Structure formats: C-alpha cells, structure tokens
Design a protein around this ligand. Structure first.
Ligand SMILES: Cc1cc(Oc2ccc(N)cn2)ccc1Cl
Length: 209
C-alpha cells in the first residue's frame, strides 16, 4: 500500500531548479547529506542523556557510506533519531517552504547552490547527482517507512517491508549515468576529507569486493 503526495510548490520548484541547472560543483551533495546525518545523531544523543532507553534501538552512533556500482546507488546511513511518518507527510514537510523561498531569492541576488545548507534544505542537493532518492527511516515512536521521489513534483511514502533498522535513516541515491564518479573510493574519500573532516561521528566508507 503506497500513498502518493504532491510536493509543496516552492519545494517542487527547488528540485526542478537543482536537477536542470548546470552547476559543476556537484560534490557538495555529500557534505549536505552527512551534515544532516550529523544533525540526526545529535538529536538522539542529546535525548539519551535524560532517557537512556532511547538508545535501546541501537547504541552505536555513526555514519556509513555504501557505494554500489552494480545498482549505481550511493547509500548514506546514520543511526540518528530517524523520522516519523508525520515527518515525511506534514512535519518536516512544512520546515522547508520557508527555507526554499529564501534560497531561490538569494540565488538571484548573488548566492549559488553550494550555500543551500545555510537555508536548512540541503537534502535536495542529492538531486544534483541522483535521478531518484529512496529514503528508509526509523524513529523510536513510529514504524519503518520508505520515502522515495524522482522529483517531478510528487513523492511516495509506504510502510517498509525490508530489513528492519532499529533506528536511523538510510538515504539511497539512484545516481545519474553521468554521476558514477561518486561511487569511486578515492573520490568519496576526497570529498569527505575536504568537506566533512570535522564531523563528531565516525564516517565509515564501505569498500566493494
Ligand atoms: C516527505 C518530504 C520530504 C522532504 O525532504 C526530505 C528531507 C530529508 C530526507 N532525508 C528526505 N526527504 C521534503 C518535504 C517532504 Cl513533504
């Protein structure tokens, strides 16, 4: 059972801007995805300081990067707070309209795409490199859900049936044919060292066999 929802017009307008505009500095998508993973870990960590039972769904706080040349997917995983169904449909949905509007205004007043983090909507930079993003998330107070969107103004949300997660969020990036450089090891390691060297959580790069 899959529910399809329409993007908010501002947020739909941003991903059409991101996918279609030529902008060679595509690598900032990883810095934004890891930063949101670092933000998710901060929330579950701070919450466990008063309620240690919140970490019962996974004590380890880390970030993994799983490139897959066969599936052409770059997968970013964290064990952070995750997201409820209200985060996908509703809650987190409404915390981007304001950030999206302010970002496109600045884009015509000098600013460029690499500043998308300063507006709290850095996730949509994933569509620089990805033609489709599937997101698997798990919050302590909700079931497991799969979020997915090829942009195009809509997204889907379904109750996930795959491997249980415990807690955290997995972001699967179905990469464009012209974006396979971000499945290379030495390319991933260079962006992580360049952009996310001061992240307070271990970023493990999984190597393919
Ligand atoms: C369902 C939804 C998702 C959304 O954007 C994000 C943000 C972060 C992650 N991990 C996935 N999608 C923005 C608006 C909506 Cl309505």
């Amino acid at each position: 059972e899959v529910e399809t929802f329409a993007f908010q017009a501002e947020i739909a307008q941003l991903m059409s801007l991101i996918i279609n505009t030529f902008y060679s500095n595509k690598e900032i998508f990883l810095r934004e995805l890891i930063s949101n993973s670092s933000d998710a870990l901060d929330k579950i960590r701070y919450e466990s300081l008063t309620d240690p039972s919140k970490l019962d769904s996974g004590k380890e706080l880390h970030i993994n990067l799983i490139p897959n040349k066969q599936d052409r997917t770059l997968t970013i995983v964290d064990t952070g707070i995750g997201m409820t169904k209200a985060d996908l449909i509703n809650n987190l949905g409404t915390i981007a309209k304001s950030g999206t509007k302010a970002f496109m205004e600045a884009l015509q007043a000098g600013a460029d795409i690499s500043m998308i983090g300063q507006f709290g909507v850095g996730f949509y930079s994933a569509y620089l490199v990805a033609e489709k993003v599937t997101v698997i998330t798990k919050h302590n107070d909700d079931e497991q859900y799969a979020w997915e969107s090829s942009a195009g103004g809509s997204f889907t949300v379904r109750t996930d049936t795959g491997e249980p997660m415990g807690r955290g969020t997995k972001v699967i990036l179905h990469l464009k044919e012209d974006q396979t450089e971000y499945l290379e090891e030495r390319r991933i390691k260079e962006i992580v060292k360049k952009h996310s060297q001061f992240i307070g959580y271990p970023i493990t790069l999984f190597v393919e066999k």
